[PDB]
Every structure is written in C-alpha cells, then in structure tokens.
Write a protein that binds this ligand. Structure first.
Ligand SMILES: c1cc2c(cn1)cnc1sccc12
Length: 253
C-alpha cells in the first residue's frame, strides 16, 4: 500500500502501532529512506481534543531544535479530516525492549538514564511537565533513547509510575518520581509497587509513608542513592532534574 504526505509519496512497509483512532506505520519515501508515519482520525474529534493535538504537535516541532533526545518530526499534513506526521523510525519502544530482555547492562542502563534526563529536562525548560511517564513513552533509536510525546495530546492507564501528588487528587518533581520508577524497573526488574495486584491497595501504598519502598543492596551504590532520591514522597524533598544531571551516578565512570 501507499500514501502521500504533502508532495512526497510513502510506501507502507508494516504497521508499527495503533493508539485507537491513531495508526503508526513504517514507511519508505521516493529516495527509499525509512520513516514512521502517524495517521490520526479527526472524524470524531472535539474542539478540545483538536486543540490538544495541535498543541502537542507545535511543541514537538518547537523542541526539535533543542534536543536530539526528542523524536525527529520531518513533516506533517493536517486537514479537518486527518493528521499525517513524518517522524524518524526507531527500533523499539523501551517498554517492549525491557519486557523482552532478562538482563540489562549497567552501562546500557546508565546511558539510557542520561538520555531520559536530557529529554525530560528539555520539555521542563519550555514549561512542560509530562505528568505521565512510562517506558512506553521512550523509543530506542541507534542505542539512544528518545521521548515520543509530552503527554499534552488526549501501555496506558498504569498507576505503577504515578507520583503521590497526582494520586492525592503537579510540578517537574512529578516527572522525577516517574523517571525513578523507570530506573527502579531497570535496576530491580519490577516497579516499586508492582508487587501489589489490587489497584486501590496499590494506590494506598504510594501515598502511605509507613509503607517503606525497599532498595535491595547493589554494587552500584550511587544508583541506589538516585532511586532513593527520585522515590522521596514529598516533592519538596525530591531531587530536581538539574541536580540529577550533576549526580555521581550520571557523571562518574
Ligand atoms: C510513534 C511510535 C514509534 C515511532 C514514532 N512514533 C517510531 N518508531 C517506533 S518503533 C516502536 C514504536 C515507534
């Protein structure tokens, strides 16, 4: 099959993912280069959803120039009926990659972490708080992690990465909580609260200071401190991203 985004023609190779009303495909242009096209159906879209879409796009377009850890958006076609986005094609999302591999290399992880701070830090600088980070939001492209979205436009639902303040009902400290959970999953093989099935009981645990989050002793003592810093329930007493980018775990060999 085929499709035309603006002037250019893109041959469909396979379907990467489907959000629901959205379909992501892997494509080829006339110069035979591989891309990822996102189809969005505006047929049953409120003017609020429309606005979230337009906002999320402009931001993704604006933030292209700032960080290389933000998915390349090459071109787009937008009508009253649909959205087409010509983005860079990654190998796999962090979630599926983590879900498959049993052993994660301390370097691969330290590297991925550094890429995760750079991405979140850039959206933060422009005023954005992602508010709902998950490994699904990150995409590996040439051993380099890239942020897919900014959680502006309307794995999903998962409360395992939710900060206590989001549950108590939101500042950059909320994204620090989530990022730490991601690291905790790449460190301990589970999210801090993955151990508790019942979603209501899982929620009571995040907001419970007496329910101690365990940090089992590891060779990377620095990595343990980062987790201990990110997973502090009081946003007031949680590490900031500029502070994390200067932590020994990230800076020291
Ligand atoms: C959304 C999702 C992806 C993308 C661009 N937008 C590019 N490559 C890949 S590989 C697995 C998911 C995706």
């Amino acid at each position: 099959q085929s499709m035309s985004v603006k002037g250019r023609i893109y041959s469909i190779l396979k379907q990467i993912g489907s959000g629901g009303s959205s379909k992501v495909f892997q494509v080829l242009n006339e110069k035979k280069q591989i891309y990822a096209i996102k189809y969005v159906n505006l047929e049953e879209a409120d003017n609020q959803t429309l606005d979230s879409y337009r906002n999320e796009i402009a931001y993704l377009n604006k933030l292209q120039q700032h960080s290389d850890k933000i998915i390349r958006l090459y071109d787009y076609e937008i009508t009253d009926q649909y959205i087409y986005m010509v983005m860079e094609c990654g190998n796999i999302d962090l979630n599926s990659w983590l879900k498959k591999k049993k052993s994660i290399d301390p370097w691969e992880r330290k590297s991925y972490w550094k890429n995760m701070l750079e991405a979140v830090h850039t959206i933060h600088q422009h005023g954005i708080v992602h508010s709902d980070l998950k490994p699904a939001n990150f995409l590996i492209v040439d051993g380099m992690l890239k942020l897919i979205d900014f959680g502006i436009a309307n794995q999903v639902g998962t409360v395992n990465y939710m900060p206590p303040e989001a549950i108590k009902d939101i500042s950059p400290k909320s994204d620090v909580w989530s990022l730490g959970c991601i690291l905790y999953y790449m460190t301990y093989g589970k999210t801090p609260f993955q151990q508790i099935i019942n979603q209501i009981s899982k929620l009571h645990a995040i907001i419970d200071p007496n329910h101690e989050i365990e940090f089992p002793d590891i060779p990377e003592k620095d990595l343990q401190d980062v987790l201990k810093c990110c997973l502090k329930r009081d946003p007031k007493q949680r590490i900031s991203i500029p502070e994390l980018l200067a932590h020994p775990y990230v800076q020291i060999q």
